């Protein structure tokens, strides 16, 4: 509303990075929408990367992140404090590294890889592997690795320490002048972060949780204009344990709060903790009004709200596709019951050998879908392409896309395919495509068991390229008028203004 | 006899310390008696403590140790030699510690606890925890602890070294000027002391045994006026392996030489080794003439003698106690068959709910006596108070004390209670209270099985406060005239003079 | 032929050393023969010893190695290169060792054994054990050993590094001026040599195999006059993987290519790899024309040749031996079926108690032959003397020697005994004594099962000292005229000239 509002939204996820999607791409778009309504919506991360500036720069150039959206990082905050406490490069650090490397001889392995040996004792001193903009230096003691200095543009940003099993047990972070501002213990057995020492402020913290809580109380002004939104479930404790009294906290659950493949009536451990404590924050936000009603009818909480996702209606291809191409662009995870779909490919091709499948994306169950299509020799017909950073250009050469799951928040990947004139085929599930797919109108829906009824539907479409177009043009105009943005945006503000 | 005798007794136990009793308190009193007869009786210990001066000072101020009694310590002997080899403080040591601490930043944990990090590399350097008179400094390498310097009044007395599992594998002891005089290897797996290097005399020793044998040959003049008395069974090898030809050696066995809870006819492993070699020293000393006769009738040894213990007849309360208070002040050990007594409390209270129990002292089987009285909910009635440094003031508010065992040397803890006008109740056993308890005269004795006959006897006393007094006044006057000191003292001298 | 031929033979075995025999003694003699025919035949080794000069010097003085025969060593090659790159002693190395030893105090253990402790901290610094011409210095860190410097004539030739389990994980070799020329990683778990760094030439090598291949291409001129002969089966990959195009390669198999105690028809793993690749080198050389025919009738290889061994007909004793002395001078290994011979001693002595046995040499199954003759109490009669560096002087006091095996190349140890007027007794086997023992003529042969038929034959000889002499004099004159050297030598040259 107000073009000069002091409202601001801090969206919290553990890490940002390139070549993902789903929850993050939803966060990127949500930031874009809020910025349009003159409300700054930025992102807060809590992990360390020495090249986040290069990653954020990439995410914006590659058109995945609105350029107005900033990422706040806990380590970038304390680094910048450190930067303004010193006004002289930390040469003693580079002298420390230089001194351990002198009186050594060099022996090359390959192009930018060399080892160094003391010319007096013959002792193994260092291993240096340098690219062109980054460099690592591994120091050795008693022929075991003890330390690694990491470089970016000839500058140290991290020092790692290694135990007896050659695993990290300690990290140090150096500012842009070479001064250490943060160091922390690492449990080598699981990689969990322990005690964290903020050297620049001479303060210690029990763990990363205690550090980021302290960080948010510094980053986020305790005003009712400050709004915290936690997408990732692994960041919720950070938002919940702050001593904010005025600031708002909204937990956004993205997934089904039901345990995967459990008929007990049990929930996800983390996704339930959020729900239980809904009456202590400003309310948990789901996506379907169904999932609201389920949580209503399970937990004693008077504070759940349903808000869908902003959709970006990009532009459909100039044409369609004629050749019997079916695709499944997704990340391979057992929760999607892909086992209960590739046994529809098999059920299709035998009635029509010209139907082809292009599988994109990666995952854990990729390598056993791989060693499964050749057991049946559908390598002939089915292809596991790979991860595509161009989801739409791979989408615009489909006749239709296919997907399934037993657990979803809603339809993200199915919706954005319907825009590109593509009639997707999926099951009816708990929370998802019971609303944006109208069966025998612009797409198809099947009970999540009748595995050849889906195999029946595909042949009603791929063999009818003139009917696999009207269903596509009735897809896009279906998305557009159904949820919009204003309907969704006013959901958010009325929650804010209260 | 002779007020100017050159006779001296060295009583040997591994360690002395505060808040114990039994064998040690017997040693403290025996020293007091011998000093009265103009024969110096001192104590020799073989362990290391940096605060033994403070402990001995406490033992005397707190009236547990005769002030004339000295403690000789093997490490205090070599420290004092070291003290007179140097006449200039070892500043290079404190410089060595200072240098490793400079260029560091401090980060506090609590009041006197801080960690230190190198301001150039961010490396974890040191952990310092200081009280007000003592201080520890833990140094780190590759984020693992390697060394600990221990301070007392700002002075180093010990440096410890740690292995990969963070356990001690090496110790160093510094004199009062900061010079190392003794270092030794420690087996981290069991804490056993290995090779011991006497740096001040440039001599090495296989273990602590070889070190203390050498020490006794220095400490104790090889004359017939020198008398060695080994109370602790764990110190006997130290006395036995010396090359003394004239000096006397007397091993004093305090306990039953029968294996605990074994009906085989087997003995304690250590207590038998002493017995087997009785014909090689000046004789083993037991406490009961019974235990003498048993050893006579088991081993071929013509050299066993029976001598009881000196009793200190202190002063009884001004009054008694009326309220049904029963106490067991003892150290909780399975050899005392406490299981076979707390199931007499149960057998008592049900006939008289006003009988109360106060349990003092500590032990291993305290925590399962604890979770046992509440299973039966005698928390109502039975109390595990705690260790009492005031045994008599806790004793002087009893009507009677109670105890049992299947194995004893004699009655120490039962005897000193009879002084304070208290009729104790105990079983008849191998070696013990068959002599200082006269049943139905001043106390009570039961077969060590009839667990409710004891429960019968208590009610014959606690419900008769006028009969639980005559039995008390017949207790003290019973101890006094029965064994005395002169009868016991002349036992010792006639052994000496031979 | 040509007294000025540029032909040269490099005989390759992994290591040479004192107190062995068999394959090596065969190599020593073969070098001697070839040198007589004006063809230099030298030996190449691939292991490290700091005292090989002293060992080779011993092998020649003790008359086991022809003085014209040289040993080439891969580490001696790179050391000599290193020697000529520096013209100033590496004092900084000895300064490095001196500095770590100053400010220490000495504590002796025995004659030439002492430990050193820092006089400031008391820290365990070093352990030095010196003989009179060699010395080791073990340095310690956190009371664990980390390094060992090895000395010969006050000069460092090796530095070893130790891991957490106190095992070698790194080696460094110093030239005769104290400069490191080679360092290498050691797998502590098995002692296998990994990455090898040639510091003097700044080159790295995957392992010892890659190092010695490179070494042979430097050592051995790629000419048809250069001839490589690989005796040891463990050195064959080194000869086979060189990029020699003109040089000749001859693999000499010494043993049975049949798996020990396997009736499957399976071969030795290594000895087969040689055979399989016979068509890629200049031919594999066996010893018996039988073993040739077997390999012919198993593998598809058109390139196997049979050449026997050069025999050194030394000089027989002035006399014989009368006293019933039977000997088995050998190295104790289960492949010799000694179990199937000592149960003929037993079968002999019972018919003649005066027959005695002298067993020389060592082995793995010595200690259970030991605890076997006393179970039967033939200690009376059978003796395990020990390893004899004087094989012939121990041979010249026998009436006859005895041996057996199920696997041999031929008869080495049986043949050289026949020279000294001794009728040996052995079984007929695969590849061996079916040719140099003529039964009931100068010796005896039995089927390798009839264990008392051999026991029958001995008594036909030891009880007939006038018949145990003619068989001896028919032994020596049997060896002499049968194979000679010229017959064997021309076998070699005709292989060379082709
Ligand atoms: C915002 C939201 O509701 N998220 C849902 C989503 O999370 P999740 O993050 O797993 O999103 P999905 O994997 O279901 O959707 C596919 C996503 O992967 C991206 N992609 C995939 C392959 C590829 O080659 N390139 C590419 O970019 C797509 O842009 C798309 O955004 O699925 C979960 C279950 O699986 C649901 O419970 C969550 O509710
Ligand atoms: C000198 C002697 O003969 N020692 C006997 C004693 O050794 P032990 O040293 O175990 O002596 P006991 O535990 O039997 O006697 C109790 C001792 O503990 C002290 N105490 C206990 C609790 C408390 O709160 N405060 C306190 O000071 C008492 O002063 C008393 O001296 O018991 C052994 C078996 O158990 C016997 O075989 C030994 O023969
Ligand atoms: C060149 C050759 O064909 N070598 C054969 C030999 O190798 P190997 O090297 O094992 O030779 P053997 O052990 O069979 O012969 C005994 C050797 O050991 C030496 N010795 C033994 C004891 C002693 O006290 N002093 C002493 O010097 C002898 O000099 C003799 O040379 O036996 C293998 C099986 O066992 C055969 O397959 C090999 O073919
Ligand atoms: Cl900002
Ligand atoms: Cl500055
Ligand atoms: Cl004194
Ligand atoms: Cl001095
Ligand atoms: Cl040469
Ligand atoms: Cl030089």
PDB file of N, CA and C in Angstrom, chain C residues 13 16 18 65 154 174 224 227 302 319 332 384 414 436:
ATOM      1  N   UNK C  13      67.111 -58.913  -9.491  1.00  0.00           N
ATOM      2  CA  UNK C  13      66.445 -59.484  -8.330  1.00  0.00           C
ATOM      3  C   UNK C  13      66.124 -58.309  -7.413  1.00  0.00           C
ATOM      4  N   UNK C  16      69.705 -58.137  -2.604  1.00  0.00           N
ATOM      5  CA  UNK C  16      70.797 -59.041  -2.263  1.00  0.00           C
ATOM      6  C   UNK C  16      71.105 -58.875  -0.779  1.00  0.00           C
ATOM      7  N   UNK C  18      73.207 -61.179   2.895  1.00  0.00           N
ATOM      8  CA  UNK C  18      74.072 -62.266   3.345  1.00  0.00           C
ATOM      9  C   UNK C  18      73.291 -63.336   4.107  1.00  0.00           C
ATOM     10  N   UNK C  65      80.389 -64.259  -3.877  1.00  0.00           N
ATOM     11  CA  UNK C  65      80.135 -63.396  -5.024  1.00  0.00           C
ATOM     12  C   UNK C  65      81.437 -63.115  -5.768  1.00  0.00           C
ATOM     13  N   UNK C 154      78.900 -41.728  11.585  1.00  0.00           N
ATOM     14  CA  UNK C 154      78.528 -40.357  11.949  1.00  0.00           C
ATOM     15  C   UNK C 154      77.828 -39.574  10.839  1.00  0.00           C
ATOM     16  N   UNK C 174      69.407 -39.639   2.325  1.00  0.00           N
ATOM     17  CA  UNK C 174      70.381 -38.563   2.181  1.00  0.00           C
ATOM     18  C   UNK C 174      71.649 -39.087   1.514  1.00  0.00           C
ATOM     19  N   UNK C 224      70.699 -53.891 -28.849  1.00  0.00           N
ATOM     20  CA  UNK C 224      70.552 -55.343 -28.900  1.00  0.00           C
ATOM     21  C   UNK C 224      71.696 -56.033 -28.158  1.00  0.00           C
ATOM     22  N   UNK C 227      71.165 -57.025 -22.547  1.00  0.00           N
ATOM     23  CA  UNK C 227      70.345 -58.196 -22.261  1.00  0.00           C
ATOM     24  C   UNK C 227      69.836 -58.175 -20.820  1.00  0.00           C
ATOM     25  N   UNK C 302      54.491 -69.893 -27.954  1.00  0.00           N
ATOM     26  CA  UNK C 302      55.446 -70.502 -28.873  1.00  0.00           C
ATOM     27  C   UNK C 302      56.874 -70.074 -28.550  1.00  0.00           C
ATOM     28  N   UNK C 319      88.971 -87.273   3.027  1.00  0.00           N
ATOM     29  CA  UNK C 319      88.390 -88.569   3.360  1.00  0.00           C
ATOM     30  C   UNK C 319      86.873 -88.572   3.213  1.00  0.00           C
ATOM     31  N   UNK C 332      63.786 -74.532   6.152  1.00  0.00           N
ATOM     32  CA  UNK C 332      62.573 -75.241   6.540  1.00  0.00           C
ATOM     33  C   UNK C 332      61.292 -74.601   5.997  1.00  0.00           C
ATOM     34  N   UNK C 384      68.617 -80.188  15.472  1.00  0.00           N
ATOM     35  CA  UNK C 384      68.440 -78.982  14.667  1.00  0.00           C
ATOM     36  C   UNK C 384      69.571 -78.012  14.981  1.00  0.00           C
ATOM     37  N   UNK C 414      70.947 -80.769  -3.832  1.00  0.00           N
ATOM     38  CA  UNK C 414      71.234 -82.195  -3.885  1.00  0.00           C
ATOM     39  C   UNK C 414      72.459 -82.446  -4.760  1.00  0.00           C
ATOM     40  N   UNK C 436      69.730 -86.367 -12.182  1.00  0.00           N
ATOM     41  CA  UNK C 436      71.071 -86.367 -11.600  1.00  0.00           C
ATOM     42  C   UNK C 436      71.220 -87.368 -10.453  1.00  0.00           C
TER      43      UNK C 436
END
